[PDB]
């Protein structure tokens, strides 16, 4: 090895993606959307494949919170870490406020 080599190259423009793998399968990597397997997995619905740690799991379920940003995790009483309702939603309680002078109707 007299010398090495370096240089930037294309990359998966699809945010959130890892860039690894290929919508074809043969290749275990990609740097474009056309070859992005993740971008295809979304548009399509093939739950065929899927591995999840299902064994000896007592607490296995998702919360029931209306708030989009809220991950149904937490509690107003500041005691637990879960909540499947508003009254319990800690992020919904603080928000509560009658008389919010500042009001921005504009929606972009």
Binding positions for Zn ion, rule: CB under 5 A: 12, 14, 17, 36, 38, 65, 67, 70, 89
Quote the least distance from Cβ 12 to Zn ion, whole Å. Answer: 3
Backbone angles phi, psi at 29, to 5 degrees: -170, 160
Would you say 22 is a known binding-site residue? no
Angle at 54 between CA 52 and CA 60, to 5 degrees: 100
The SS3 of residue 29 is strand
C-beta of 2 vs 49, nearer to Zn ion:
49
**Residue 64 counted as an annotated binding residue:** no
The reply to whether 70 sits in an annotated binding site is yes
Phi/psi region, residue 25 (left: phi>0; alpha: psi -120 to 50; beta: rest), is: left
Binding positions for Zn(2+): 12, 17, 30, 36, 65, 70, 83, 89
């Amino acid at each position: 090895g007299s010398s090495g080599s370096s240089g930037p190259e294309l990359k998966c423009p699809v945010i959130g993606c890892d860039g690894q793998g290929h919508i074809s399968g043969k290749y275990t990597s990609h740097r474009t959307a056309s070859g992005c397997p993740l971008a295809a997995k979304r548009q399509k619905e093939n739950p065929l494949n899927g591995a999840s740690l299902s064994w000896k799991l007592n607490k296995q379920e998702l919360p029931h919170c209306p708030l989009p940003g809220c991950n149904g995790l937490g509690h107003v009483n500041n005691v637990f870490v879960t909540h499947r309702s508003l009254s319990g939603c800690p992020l919904n309680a603080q928000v509560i406020k009658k008389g919010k002078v500042s009001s921005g109707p504009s929606s972009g």
